[PDB]
Every structure is written in C-alpha cells, then in structure tokens.
Design a protein around this ligand. Structure first.
Ligand SMILES: NC(=O)CN(CC(=O)O)CC(=O)O
Ligand SMILES: NC(=O)CN(CC(=O)O)CC(=O)O
Ligand SMILES: NC(=O)CN(CC(=O)O)CC(=O)O
Ligand SMILES: NC(=O)CN(CC(=O)O)CC(=O)O
Ligand SMILES: [Cl-]
Ligand SMILES: [Cl-]
Ligand code: NA
Ligand code: NA
Ligand code: NA
Ligand code: NA
Lengths: 367, 367, 367, 367
C-alpha cells in the first residue's frame, strides 16, 4: 500500500490538534494511520514523562475520528524520542496508507512502511544475543510487511525496546538469571545498542555478533538503525521505512551517514539519496518545500574531540553530554533543513560509526 | 598607530597557557606586546564558573614571567573569558599583540587595529542602570581612541566583560544602603551584558542615551557590534575595540554581519566575506584554506519562543537553562561553517543585535 | 459543618491512583466525599514539570469512575500537586474527605475541618500584583466560610496552587496589549507563590492590603499559615483552608508552627505538639507511634546566603537551582523528624513565614 | 605528637584567610600543619575545579607564614571533597602538631594523625587487587605514622586516589593492559571503592577480596573509610585519624555508622564514641561548643527506597542523585551539629553499609 507522510507540530505537550486537522481536511484518514514517530519536549533521559502524555493525546484523536476501537488504536506503533534541546521543535511524523483510488502506481521507488513486534524480551535478554536474535527476526517480519525483499531498500528502522528496572531486575534474579547492568540509564543505551545489532544482523550489514561485542565493538553498526527505549513494553516495536517499486505515492526515503556532529554534507547526502537533485553546495533555500523530515542519531566521541579539537562533553557532570550533543546537532541539522522540526536522537551505540550516526531523509517527489 | 598579530590557541586543560608560552618562545609574538586576550573556557558559563578565573591567572602568569611587564601592568591587560563550551565548542584563547613596524608590510588596505580600556569600577548598584551605561560609553570612547579610530563605522567588534551580581556583591550594595536591579544572580548576567551593550551603542552613536526603563525592555535598541559577556573576574568593564585602519599593515582584517536567528549560517558567511576573505558563492568550510582565525558572536533564545515559526521549549526549561541549550546549538551551527570547533560563541544578547539573533564578527588572515 | 477523614497514600508511579481506588473499595472513604487532595509528585518541581498534570488526571479519573459525581463536578475538587521530590521525599497524596456524622464521635475537642474554593481566573497580567492579591483574598474568604470558620486563629494551613508564567501565557498577555511582572518563567514561580501568600495574609487579617511595590520586596510581610505552590495545571487559585472546629468530631486535628530556618527540627516538633499529639520532651520519630498523618511546610534559601552564620553557595549555583537544593535538604531535615519520607515539603516561600524559613503544619490522628 | 584541630570557613572559593588568622593569633603554627581536609563549593562531580583553587590558596598561606619551602608545603596532604549542596558550608579542617611545651601528656585517648602515600597506581590497577594491596600497605604505613598499632583506634581514613582519563586509558592500552571502565565518573566511584576495600583489608575489617567483588559485593565495606578521587596524583594519599594514649592534646575522635540517609542516631553515636556524655535524645544545643566536625558518607540505596518509601533519586536524569543525597544528608547532619560546616561526601562504595556510610566525629575534651 502507498503511504502518505505528514509532519505536524505539537503546540504543547498534550496537543494532537494538527493530526485532528489533517483528518478533518481529508489529508489522511484516522483508521489508515499505521505509525507515528515524534519528538517530545521532556528531558530526553530516564525520567521523561512527556512521551506518555503525547501518546495519550494522539491515540485519543485516532479513536475519536475513526471507526477503530481503542484496542485497535492501541496496537498502532507510536515512538516518541524525548528531548528537544535548543531549537528542536516538538512534532510528530504521521505515516498513513492511502486508498487505491487516490494513487497512481509507478515503477519508481516510493515510500513503504512495515511494522512488527518481537517476541517477549526478558530482562536477562537485554543487551545479549537473545535480544539480538529476537530483534533480527522481527526486523525481517517488518521488512516483509513493508513489501521489501532487498535490504538495500531499507533506509530507516525505528525501534522501541524495554529498559531494565528494579522490578524486572528482581524478576531476572528470582529465576536465577543475571542482567547486563543494574543502572537504568545504562540499560537504555544497552537496549538501544543490542537492538541496533539485531537490525544490522537482519539487514546483512554485519555477521552475528557475540555477547562480548555489545557496547564494545563500535566498528559494528547498522547504517539505518534508530533505537529508543522505555518502560512501556516488554518486547521490541519495529517500524521499517524504505522504498518499493510499483506501489505509487508521493514520497521517497533515502539515507546516508553523519561522520561527526558537524557533518552537514552527510545530511545533504541523505536528501540526495532520497531523490532530490540539488546543487553541489546546497542550502536550505534549495529544498522548495520538498523535505518532509530528517531522522538521525548523534553522539559525543569517546576520544573527546571533534575534527582535532578537544571538547569537555564527556566529563560534564552539570549537563549530561546527551543534552549538549542533542542541542548542537539540532542546530547543525535545522540549519540544513531550515525547519527546526527535525528528528534528532541520542544513545547511538552500534547506530552509525563512533561519534556519528545514521541520517535518513523523506522527501516529497510527486507521482 | 600599530599593526596587530592575532593567534588563536587551544587550551589543553583549565589551567593551560602553554600554547601562549610557545608562541613567545618561537618568536611569533612578544609577551609585553600582548594587549588583549579573548577566549572560551570549559566551565558552566553561569555565575559559579571558576574556570574563567583559573585561565586568567594562568595567562597573566605567563605574560608576567616571559616579559618585563610587572604583574601590575599585566593586570591591566583586558582578558575576557566567556565560560561555557557546551557541545563541540573547544576551549581556546584569541591573543592580540602589537607588532613592530619593521615586521609588517604597510598597506593602504584596511588591516586590524585594537583599542583597549578598563572602565571605572562598576558597583553592584550600577549594574543594569544608567551608571553602567555612561561609565561603559566612556571606556568605549577611550578604547576607540586607543585603536586610532575616529569613525565608528570602522569598529566591527567590541568585546566586553563586566561583573554580574553575586550574593557577596548584593550583600555589599545593601550594607551601604543601596539597591540592585535584581537579586537573581543568574538573571544579573543577562542584565550586565545588556547595560554594557547600550553603553557601547551610545558610545558609537548607534542609539540615543536610553533610560533605566529601557534596559532589558526595549530590545529594538541595540548595538550591531557589541559582544558583552559577564562573570566574576573583574569589577570593571574590560573593553576591547576591534576594527580596521588603512596604512598600518599587518596580515589580519576584521569584518562583521548579523545572525538573524540561531540557524543563520549565511550571516556568519557574510561576516567572513565582510572581513575581506574572497570566497565562492555557496561557500563551504573547505573553502577557508586556513584563513579564518576565528569568529565571535552572540546568540539567544527569542522571547517569542519560536525559530522560523517553530515552537521550542527553551524558555520553560527548568532543567537545563536556555543559555546552555542555545549556546550548544549555535556552537554547532557556527562550527559547521568554520569547520573548527574553536569558535567564540557567547550567550545572552540583550541590546546586542536584533532580538533572537546577535552580531557576528570574523577575523581573517589575508597576508 | 462536617467531619473529615484524612489519608496519606503513596504514589507507586507517576500515573498511579491505585491507593485512592483501594481506600474507596475498602469503605475507608467515599469517592464523592473527597473534597481536596494535596500531594507531592516526582517531576522537577519547576516550570516544565508534567508529573503534576499526570497525577491530576489519574486522581480525577478515579474520582469520576467510582462516584456519581460528573467529570465536571470532579474538576472543581482542588487538587494541589507540589512537584519535586528531591532526595528522600516520597511521592504521595494526602486525601481529605467528608465523613457522615453517623460514623464519627462528636466531641467538644477541636477536630479537623476543611474549606475549599477556586478563585477567579488569574490572567498572566495579574500574577504578582494586587489583582492576584484581591482575587486570592476573596477565594480564601470563601474557603474559610466553607470550613465553618469565622475566627482566623482557627486556621492552621492554607494550601494553594496557582499558575506561574509560561512562554504561552506571556505570549497571551502581550497579544492583548498587557504586561507581565517578569518573563523569566522560573522566576514567576516565586512570584506567584508570593502574591498568593499576601492574599492569604490579607484575608486572615495578618497584614494590611499591600502595594504592587511590596510584592517580593517586603519580606517582613507574611502569612504564618500560607503554603503556596505554583505550576501549570490550572489558571485559577485552588484554595484549601484547613483548621479545627469544636463539636464536629472526627479523628484528626491540625496544628502549626514556624521553621525559623532550614535546620529547625524543633519548629516541626512544635507543629506536631500544637496539633494535639502529646509527646515527650526531647521527642524522637519513634515517639509518633503511627499518629502523624503528614507535615506540610515551606522552605527557602535566605537572601543573605547564610544559615546560622555559615555561608552556603545556593544562590550563586547556576548548575542546580537552589529550589532543588533546599528542597532536598529540608526533605531530609523533615523526614528525620517524622521518620517517614512521605512529607509535604514545598519550596519558594516569599511572604510565607519569616525570611529563610516557612510555616509548618501537622495533622495528627488522635481518635 | 599531640594534635590541634581547627575547622575554618572558606569565605569564597580562593579564601584561606581564616587559616592565616589562626597562625597570626598563635593558635597553630604554619610549619606544624600536617594535613587539611575540606569541603569546596564546586559541583562535586568530575569537572569540579574548586578543589584546585582552594589548594593553591591554602598552600600559599602555608608557604608565606612559615619557614617551609614551597616544595615542602607541596607534600602536605590536602584533600578537598567538592559539592556543598544545600546548607553545607565550605570549610577546611586543619590538623597541626603541637609543641611539647604546650601539652600535658595523659593516658586518656587523644587524637593522632598519620599520613602516607602509596606506590604508584597504574590505570590498570584502578578498581582491582593491585590497587587494594597497594592501598592496604600505605594505610598500614599511615597507621604506624599515627602511633597506632590497634586498628580499633582508627576512626577515620580519608584518601585521595586517581581516576581514569582518556590519556591514562590510552597508556594502559599502549602497554597491553585493560582498564575496569573507560567512563570517568564511573572510574571515580571505582577508585573510591577499591581504595575503601584496601582500607578495610589493612584494618582487618575484611579478608582480601577478589577483582569480582569490587563494586559488586556491597556486604564488604570499611566502617571508617572516606575515599575521594581526582586527576592530581598517580598514587593514593592516605590520612589516618585515630586516638593514642600517652600523647596528650585536647581532641578525641570517635565513629559509628549511618544506616540510611535519615539516621541522625548514628551521628549521635559517633559523637558519643568520641567521648561526649549526652542525653538519651540529644539536641544540637547540648554540644556546648564541643564538636569540631563530623565526617561522613551517604548514598542512595539500590533498592530505590528509604524506610519503605520509594524515592526517584536513581532515575533522575536532571539532577544526579549524588547532589540530591548530598543536600538531604547535609541537612540531616547539620540539624544534629547545629553547624552547617559539616564534611558530607558521596561516592560510598564499600564505605559503610549499602544506603548508608561511616560517620566520624572529632570533639574537644580538654587535657
Ligand atoms: N533510548 C532513548 O529513548 C533515548 N531517548 C530517551 C528519551 O526519549 O527520554 C533520548 C532520545 O531518543 O534522543
Ligand atoms: N555573562 C555571560 O555573558 C555568560 N558568559 C559565559 C561566562 O560566564 O563566561 C558568556 C557566554 O557564554 O555567553
Ligand atoms: N511553584 C512552586 O511552588 C514549586 N512547587 C513545585 C511544583 O511545581 O509543584 C512547590 C514546591 O516544590 O515547592
Ligand atoms: N570521589 C570524589 O572525590 C567524589 N567527590 C567529587 C568531587 O569532589 O568533585 C564528591 C564528594 O566527595 O562528595
Ligand atoms: Cl483501498
Ligand atoms: Cl617540640
Ligand atoms: Na554511533
Ligand atoms: Na540579540
Ligand atoms: Na519564608
Ligand atoms: Na555505603
């Protein structure tokens, strides 16, 4: 099925009015919304409750404006990446199917979305091979759901997986199991990293790694993974976004890599991959309304430098480098797109090269 | 009227002045000819940032050790440390020194000139009021004459460092039966920079002498060259006027423009072009070819809580003050233009450039 | 005039109202008889604390589900959530409900009574000025009558929750050509609490009607029972007057005293004794024997930057706002008296108790 | 030799004037100062530069007012624990020897101090048995230096050991070694924990642990250890404080344990152990000038609770629990002593039981 993609701003933490307005104006249909991926204005760490508030707001609009039951609505994968430091604007990217009578099928590659949920992820699985294999299997399922057989047509895989809590850790130990760590913040970075290796395994980017590789072998990464985590579910939510020929629709996705926090060229590369023809040295004013959004990861390098210059991110006990780097890359990124509503996420283990991250772009080409 | 040598050096640690000492040993410049230092330090950028005083002592001790100047003479050298290097911003110092005429090529081309002055003491009473404004305008007058400049249009950058209010100085004001504009120490930073900036704008004929009521409230009143920073390392306004003069010689030239908002990379390019560095249209950092010494700019979160029509949550964020968010964001924006994370980005820009933006100055090496 | 049941319950998570639901199911109290809730939530305690709105929705949904009251009637129940549980402070809610006379033992002994009132809307314009003061004094009047109290001396605790200024409401004020006392959102919290407190002190005859100029500046003007908190969950002053009346019956009684500074455990003991709980001289937490329901108090960092002649660095700390430092400190001081980390400790106490201290109220179970 | 102990406030970050004044008034002699242990007003994390500034200030007073050379002065162990959240007042406890003609020797136990430096601590030693054994050996050396053979007369062991940095980690790997972790904040907690096990080994509190025990076996701890760490030295600084009979002097030290953050009784226990006779339920007003200082550790329990009440310290990404717990326990502690100048330190692995910490008290008894 062909996909409509719409990026809407959130006017406040519990606002889903722009989604409601798209529905009223006939831009998309509530019951055809199949995935939502957004940025929320919480702290972007462990105790970020803005992700819960947005979820309820969006689900209430979907239930109210459609014939779907609140149970069906609850199955819709909605992934919120918290923390909008600096200029980053809270927003949600909405993915919906399009009725056939609204589309002109084309052999040109156009956007497709696949979804899947993994098998249950036990606490003792988190960060270990069991998480990797269960994720890999669900990524293959989502890939098929998207109608994609070739991994090269996958450009962006957004996930949400569980973190470790006092309670789940207690559960692991009650059944004679161990856990990779007991620190909740660490368990997040771990859960993301293990999920990312699963993605890279599923897509043939890497051979199956060992337990020992997880968080250590930073040469091993997915070039399309975007992993987040939270306390909501005990399994992996997968959303695969790629292209398929013969489906029709207006939008196409592309990706590249950001080698470091300042790599605007890598963002331009993603937009070019997505199907825009741009000048050698593009500027935001060249986009002509055609860029829907970009989705990327970023991180502070372990060597404490960017382009041979020392920075103090890693030792900063006042403001965690997660927030510093997020705001920095938010600006770098919004300077390319000209739109502060950009999807910039942190916690990037095994997601792009060390000090960098994958970057995906969705563009509006027409039929 | 004397030619200037300008060198940007990294700080390897909080108390490191080794690269200054090395410049002196290699004959690049003479200790007694150092007339001003402007740098970035890795502290929190707020009130209780002691990284500014540590760098100050480190640099002054090098200057007094390697020269014939007395620690008293050395103490009158304006050294401005803008704390806070959120994100990629690399701790560094820009050193300005005079050069004997025998080492320069005189030219009718405009080349860099620097004037320095220390205002009268600024009491806590004065901060943010007409007393700060008139004392500053006076020291700016002095500095302009010291640079050999009579026309304000040749001024491209006025960097100041003034006191903010601390518990101790607020205790002082009240012990003498005086009053202070605010007792929120972190608020007092914004006020100190703002009052100083109006003093600069008064001295350069950019605005008519304002009233107490105008300070922080009349944001339409601003200097287009003022870069005012504040901290706890001298109870006087350290003033550094930087412009160009014809017939003096030297390798360096300064230019400026304005950043209309945090994402306005074109405004930074404009400054570099204004400084006389001939660049292609559609420039990229790879065009600089080692020729940009540094940029110096201000940034701020707009009072309307938006950038380019997109809401952000900076002004409501009680976790990480918007000073630090915007500083990291614009650090990245800026370093993406220069390709060098050692950039002078300072926050809190009341009456310094238009609201939501700031002035940006560039020093280039033209030979 | 009606007897009160008071129950303090833990919050197990941010959206947990299960212990309220359990009280209702076990017949401890009736949903429709809940007249006020006062609690602590685990958010940051500042402007962008959304844990208050999450708890609000959770509690109101229990009240509307288990009772015959309409969600509209339920919405008029004053629920005050003081965010920020730094240190040991345990998220919890104190529930106040009426009790049918058939379930109480009438007594000429003083026993708890509660009055409630919601003020008129508070515009952003009004916050911190006489308009807030006179609107509050009026709603406090209403609440006192609702509690069946004519003598202000029988009032021991007036808890309020008022709006603070946010970007959005500041945008509103200006869109209508109005002005605001400040635009520093986090500053506006201190102001909101202070203006409300003067309204309480005016209503209870503690002070003469003050001027705009007195707000935040005349700290000698205060209420000895006011506990004013502020946030973003209603644009009206939720007022809860708590005192004692003779001849009503019930198990609980309230008392109050004052904490002269953050370390004044004796002032907290004094409140408990005032409430009618007979304790040994030289009391210890082990003397309470289950009989202290909760304490409710304010704290603040003194303007002089000292406690008992010792300097602290709270007011100069740009990393962790003194709100959070003092809240954690007094949380521990307080919980060391009660032996129960579930204590109502709120920060920012302008015109609420003497400068550097705050009122403290205690509710005890006497049977 | 007999010891004089004096606690002085720091009026500012670079103030050592009260030390200078003690010397001028003849209270102690500069050249007889043998150790300094204090609290500084920095953030108490990794990037805390207030410890450097205080060091220089104190050493300059010692060099100026005595005949010791700046090299001899540099050998004086000075240990700064950063972070003074809440009411905690910056201060330094000064330990000096007393000339014989100033003392009356007594068989009563009185205060003694021993110092020692360990063998070099390589990065690969940190957190492992090599650190444990090298520390144990230096603790035995310091114990002998104090004139103590019985470990039961040791009440407080304050240390300073190295953390892991990018550079030292690079060194370890260049020589084919590994490190326990590469995170600097973690390396601090590790360095403290390993040092603490070394102390407990030296004093016979525990049998020699394994690598696997470090940071994991929290049942293993020293009841007198107080460990800090920083980038200054590559070996362990040890300061043993205990009692010896037959030496004379006015002061005596005692200790106990704080079982949890609210355990004022444990602090009272230490003061009683130190030789004060106090009421069953003591109050700060009973101390009658006799308490010099208390020295303790605190921490947030891994179970997320205090006395059966949940708190949100561990998940708080806005304000690290180190700062929360420090401020909370600062208040608890200052409420017992009545003096906000208290030595409260965090990072307490293997230093007291889990959720608690050792507490030591020095009291003034006379001859
Ligand atoms: N694991 C995550 O979800 C990391 N998140 C945490 C959060 O959303 O609060 C930050 C981000 O996505 O940028
Ligand atoms: N007072 C200020 O201007 C803040 N300063 C930071 C500082 O204290 O140095 C300049 C900046 O970072 O913007
Ligand atoms: N506005 C306030 O009073 C802050 N509030 C916290 C909050 O937002 O709930 C009370 C407190 O913690 O002291
Ligand atoms: N390891 C340490 O030194 C922990 N410190 C760190 C610091 O001093 O900055 C905090 C404390 O001692 O309470
Ligand atoms: Cl169809
Ligand atoms: Cl002697
Ligand atoms: Na990466
Ligand atoms: Na500006
Ligand atoms: Na008060
Ligand atoms: Na411990």
């Amino acid at each position: 099925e062909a996909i409509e993609v719409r990026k809407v701003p959130l006017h406040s933490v519990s606002d889903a009015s722009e989604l409601a307005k798209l529905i009223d104006d006939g831009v998309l249909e509530a019951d055809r919304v199949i995935a939502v991926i957004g940025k929320t204005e919480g702290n972007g760490g462990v105790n970020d409750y803005t992700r819960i508030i947005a979820d309820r707001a969006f689900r209430e609009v979907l239930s109210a404006k459609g014939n779907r039951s609140p149970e069906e609505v609850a199955e819709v994968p909605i992934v919120w990446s918290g923390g909008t430091d600096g200029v980053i604007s809270p927003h949600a990217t909405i993915f919906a199917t399009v009725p056939a009578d609204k589309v002109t099928k084309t052999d040109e590659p156009r956007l497709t979305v696949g979804v899947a949920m993994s098998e249950q992820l036990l606490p003792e699985d988190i960060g270990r091979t069991a998480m990797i294999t269960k994720v890999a299997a669900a990524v293959k399922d989502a890939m098929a759901d998207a109608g994609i057989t070739d991994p090269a047509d996958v450009h962006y895989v957004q996930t949400k997986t569980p973190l470790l809590t006092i309670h789940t850790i207690r559960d692991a130990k009650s059944r004679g199991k161990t856990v990779w760590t007991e620190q909740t913040h660490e368990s997040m970075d771990l859960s993301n990293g293990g999920t990312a290796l699963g993605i890279a395994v599923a897509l043939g980017e890497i051979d199956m790694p060992t337990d020992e590789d997880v968080m250590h072998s930073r040469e091993l990464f997915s070039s399309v993974a975007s992993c987040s985590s939270g306390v909501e579910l005990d399994r992996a939510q997968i959303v695969v976004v790629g292209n398929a020929r013969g489906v029709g629709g207006r939008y196409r996705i592309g990706h590249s890599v950001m080698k470091d926090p300042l790599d605007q060229d890598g963002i331009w590369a993603a937009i070019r991959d997505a199907g825009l023809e741009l000048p050698e040295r593009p500027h935001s004013s060249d986009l002509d309304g055609q860029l829907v959004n970009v989705f990327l990861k970023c991180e502070a390098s372990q060597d404490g430098t960017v382009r041979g210059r020392r920075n103090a991110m890693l030792d900063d006990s006042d403001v965690h480098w997660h927030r510093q780097i997020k705001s920095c890359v938010g600006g770098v990124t919004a300077a390319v797109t000209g739109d502060p509503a950009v999807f910039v996420s942190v916690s990037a283990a095994h997601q792009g090269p060390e000090g960098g991250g994958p970057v995906a772009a969705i563009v509006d080409l027409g039929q």
